[PDB]
């Protein structure tokens, strides 16, 4: 599981 | 601007 | 699962 | 999943 | 711009 | 994932 | 700007 | 300018 944002 | 995913 | 906006 | 905007 | 994937 | 914004 | 996984 | 990746 995993996740980013900018 | 952002994703996730599992 | 995923999923991704901008 | 992918996503772009500008 | 922005951008993202996963 | 991955992001990015400019 | 940030992102997490595991 | 900002960037993430996991």
Same mark, same amino acid.
């Given at each position: $599981?995993? $996740? $980013? &944002? &900018?």
């Amino acid at each position: $599981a995993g $996740a $980013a &944002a &900018a």
